[PDB]
Write an enzyme that holds these catalytic residues in place. Structure first.
Site, PDB file in Angstrom:
ATOM      1  N   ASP A  10       0.848  -1.184   0.000  1.00 27.63           N
ATOM      2  CA  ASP A  10       0.000   0.000   0.000  1.00 27.63           C
ATOM      3  C   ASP A  10       0.885   1.236   0.000  1.00 27.63           C
ATOM      4  O   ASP A  10       1.792   1.358   0.829  1.00 27.63           O
ATOM      5  CB  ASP A  10      -0.912   0.014   1.234  1.00 27.63           C
ATOM      6  CG  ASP A  10      -2.206  -0.758   1.034  1.00 27.63           C
ATOM      7  OD1 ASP A  10      -3.176  -0.476   1.771  1.00 27.63           O
ATOM      8  OD2 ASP A  10      -2.272  -1.638   0.157  1.00 27.63           O
ATOM      9  N   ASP A 129     -13.350  -7.225  -4.632  1.00 25.46           N
ATOM     10  CA  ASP A 129     -13.519  -7.224  -3.185  1.00 25.46           C
ATOM     11  C   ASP A 129     -14.901  -7.784  -2.876  1.00 25.46           C
ATOM     12  O   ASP A 129     -15.896  -7.289  -3.408  1.00 25.46           O
ATOM     13  CB  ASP A 129     -13.407  -5.807  -2.613  1.00 25.46           C
ATOM     14  CG  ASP A 129     -12.035  -5.179  -2.823  1.00 25.46           C
ATOM     15  OD1 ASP A 129     -11.060  -5.911  -3.095  1.00 25.46           O
ATOM     16  OD2 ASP A 129     -11.938  -3.938  -2.693  1.00 25.46           O
TER      17      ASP A 129
END
Length: 249
Positions: A10, A129
């Site tokens: 990230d 997701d």
């Protein structure tokens, strides 16, 4: 069946979010140096997920890709807020091997086909997701904020029909928990698609990777277990090979 071990970083404003515990590095928060290190110690691919502001985001991601390409030889994917063909095209041309799209693919599934027609299906990772809602696997967008009302089962089939090359399947139910990959979700998706499945979310210990590959994942993605040195990549690969998983040693 060859299996891949993939590190996820990230990134925000060019920094690794929450850094890493590698004191041997000049800057343990520099995603280029950390990514280079991972490629030297046996990681198979890298995934960079950018959560930069929105104003500097486009330039910041193109700089990341340029700097990563200068230093890393293994394939890498960039994603996070890629909303159209020209954004994806510039990132691939600047050096990325693959782009990850989620929200914009759900809202405009032809975007999958558009990128694939120029860069090949293998350059298009659709990140899905998913979370259990009232006993069904549902597709979520906007970093988990929106339940789309689209069933995971239908979206997987459509994603392949539209020409995606890989599915990055993140279980919202497990992401960040270190309690294990969502092997039920992986097994649910596996018969619905011929595409490679990257399992994402829940990794906590080496045995979790074995379970994910038994569930049919083609690749296992993890972040914090690697950055915080809870799992050694080489020890992980030797463990998996020992128990019959075809990893690259």
């Amino acid at each position: 069946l060859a299996k891949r071990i993939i590190a996820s970083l990230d990134v925000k404003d060019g920094r690794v979010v929450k850094g890493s515990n590698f004191e041997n590095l000049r800057d343990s928060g520099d995603p280029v140096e950390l990514g280079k290190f991972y490629s030297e110690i046996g990681i198979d691919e890298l995934v960079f997920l950018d959560i930069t502001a929105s104003v500097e985001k486009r330039k910041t991601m193109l700089e990341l890709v340029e700097k990563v390409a200068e230093q890393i030889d293994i394939p890498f994917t960039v994603g996070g807020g890629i909303h159209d063909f020209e954004t994806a095209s510039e990132l691939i041309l600047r050096g990325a091997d693959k782009v990850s799209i989620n929200t914009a693919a759900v809202e405009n599934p032809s975007l999958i086909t558009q990128i694939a027609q120029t860069f090949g299906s293998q350059a298009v990772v659709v990140a899905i997701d998913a979370k259990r809602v009232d006993g069904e696997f549902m597709v979520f967008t906007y970093s988990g904020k929106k339940n789309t009302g689209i069933l995971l089962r239908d979206w997987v089939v459509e994603v392949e029909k539209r020409g995606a090359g890989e599915i990055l399947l993140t279980s919202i139910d497990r992401d960040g928990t270190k309690s294990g990959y969502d092997t039920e979700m992986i097994r649910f998706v596996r018969p619905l698609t011929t595409l490679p499945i990257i399992a994402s979310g829940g990794a906590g210990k080496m045995e979790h990777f074995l379970e994910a590959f038994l569930a049919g994942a083609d690749a296992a993605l993890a972040a914090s277990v690697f950055h915080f040195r809870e799992i050694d990549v080489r020890e992980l690969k030797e463990y998996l090979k020992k128990h019959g998983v075809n990893v690259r040693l």
